[model samples]
Target: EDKMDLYLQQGMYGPLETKPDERHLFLGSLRERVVLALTKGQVLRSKPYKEAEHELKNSHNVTLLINGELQYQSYSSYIQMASRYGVPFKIVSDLQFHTPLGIVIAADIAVNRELIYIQDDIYNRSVL
Candidate 1:
């Protein structure tokens, strides 16, 4: 009875979260739910990734999540693209925790997609 009481108290005070670190890193989304993720450096690049554009153009029911910590100039192109595709987008700014990820595209349900991150080879070639 005492153990149950303690559990209830904790549950009431602090709702349980699964993979808090992963969620934080992915801008309030799980890895399995993410369709695409871009690091801060990548987002700040002069040219946006073609892969991101492809996913935004083709995917459905996916919302774009941008890091609020980044300057608007860094992620504005994505917001514009999201608008062009009729995809919803949000800027996540949690004062408590900061994430290195600058942009994320996520679905409401798990997609279980592999290769969510941009490939190094692709990035290098694209930069050239």
Candidate 2:
């Protein structure tokens, strides 16, 4: 109840619905996304400051540079490249932020930017 209220208050122009209207399937998807965002935000916030900083420092591994001027490449092509290098990769998705406005602006900037970087992990942390 509290979590639902928190997210609802943070979003929309009208009185928000915590539960999606079954009539609209789009809201169903949106509802799942909203809940996921809330959970992600909570988990991220709970991480220790040192742990967060450490991960940030090690974040750079493999990088996929996207220039909007170029034609779109096939998903398989991108996935194949990451697979060849044995790195984790995903196209892109919402990176949950604490505030509603923060995530909105972050996503907006990413979408609008002509250049985007998709970085992957290539670190060999495996014990020999």
Candidate 3:
């Protein structure tokens, strides 16, 4: 088994459920559950945010590489981009890669699976 240091922010210890006023929701914490399943440098490519859009609209899947550095601004930016364009995509990290959301130790959005969005939290799954 791979033994890696998984750190948590102060907000992570609290309740992270679907609640009102998303600004305070620990929704992003869900990534922790997914990240634990991935090992450092393990890459995974998604099947496309929308299969039809990928073929008809010719959309591309987000390329994500594991073991990335700190990137919160980047994540938030992607969230905005998708929200604006209505094109779902996870931030890719390979020749790709922000922020102060603590050092991203176990996760780097390596190959975005199906994206799950909430008012504030967003989590991707392994099985599409």
Candidate 4:
């Protein structure tokens, strides 16, 4: 969490939907919805803009120790990167809505010195 606090400007929050005139149907307000978003050290590896493209995928909530601080991102975020960079990327099943949910339940990596228990929202599981 402390790591994210340092690179707050690199946060990614965009329109969930858009109109013909280019006006955006913004996703829920970041200030309210972003509980651990920027506060966590996660980065935008892919973009979950389209619900259909996002459905079959799972969130890439990986937790293997690496040297120094790396930009942690989701599978959706990575997809966006491939698109933007004009590089073809193979689609994987690790970017669905409940992708983060899978991370919390990982017995493989659960026993961590820095335990990772991700919470989506207080009212419902919106971001997980």
Candidate 5:
């Protein structure tokens, strides 16, 4: 019975989070769960990545996470695509900390995807 009180306290204060830094960077998702992630600079670009659209269309049970700090126009293309593909979307706003990522497409559970980032210089070779 005493443990129940502790459980309530933990819930009220927010239970211990695993990999808080990673979660913060990915807009509340673990690295293993992310299918696609774009930096703030990338999302601000006039053109959104084609890769994002492809994943949005193909991935199942995924959600689009957008940084609320950014102006809607910056990430509007993603929102439109999410709606078109019937994927849920959320704008994550944290007053205490800001993440480097502007958009993240992630599943509720871990997918352990490889090469989830679209940064060209980092992953220049096209396997497909």
Candidate 6:
């Protein structure tokens, strides 16, 4: 049995509704993402400093260097390379801030798509 409850919504600009509407669907998806972000947290400052440092250090395992230049690769590689580039990297999310701007980042920075395919660009920059 196909148990997927797929809802194809009508696209229009009107009052937000619980019925079939694109705005509602977008809000639904956005709400789910926000709730997920609220639960899935990175190391928080509420934790011990050493533990936060350790979490930051251990967040990534793989590092990729492009032609002897520290380049931004995957998320993991970017973490490793950022530190190498003299930019201090922190694993803590913006949830602790809890303000409007922080909330914006909380949702935006939470999860990334993994199915993107890309090729190497000139000067060797990778894109998704």
lDDT scores for all predictions?
0.75, 0.26, 0.26, 0.25, 0.74, 0.23
- For candidate 2, the 10 contiguous residues with the lowest summed lDDT are 119-128
Regions more than 4 Å wrong, model 6: 1-74, 94-128
Best by TM-score: 1
Q: Candidate 1 lDDT, tens digit per residue, 1-128?
A: 45434422222122224568467668898867888888677898888888889989998899999989999999999998999999999999873566556888998898887567675643333322
Model 6: per-residue lDDT, tens digit, 1-128?
A: 01111111111113324433321222222322221111111111122223223333443432111111112222344345337534343333322222111000112322332211111121022110
- Model 1: runs farther than 4 Å from truth? 1-18, 121-128
Model 4 over residues 20-88: C-alpha lDDT tens digits? 211111011112222122111223223333321232132233211111122334443534533443433
User: Which whole-number lDDT from 0 to 100 does residue 58 have in model 3?
Assistant: 31
TM-score of candidate 6 relative to the true fold = 0.18
Give the TM-scores of the predictions, in the order they appear.
Answer: 0.78, 0.20, 0.19, 0.18, 0.77, 0.18
Give one digit per residue, the lDDT tens place, for model 5 in 16-128: 24577467667888777888877677787787788999999998999999989899989999999999899999999863566556788999888877667775632222211
Colliding pairs, model 6: none
Candidate 2 clashes: the total is 0
Model 3: per-residue lDDT, tens digit, 42-112? 11222222322222133233222222342454244323443454444333333211222211212223323
Distance (Å) between predicted and true CA of 75, model 4?
4.0
Q: How much is 116 displaced in model 1, in angstroms?
A: 0.2
Our tally of clashes for model 6 stands at 0
Lowest lDDT 10-residue stretch of candidate 3: 1-10
lDDT, candidate 2, 14-104, per-residue tens:
2236334310211122322221111112212322223222322343343222212223332334334435544344333332312221111
Model 5 poorest 10 in a row by lDDT: 7-16
Q: What order do candidates take by TM-score, descending?
A: 1, 5, 2, 3, 6, 4
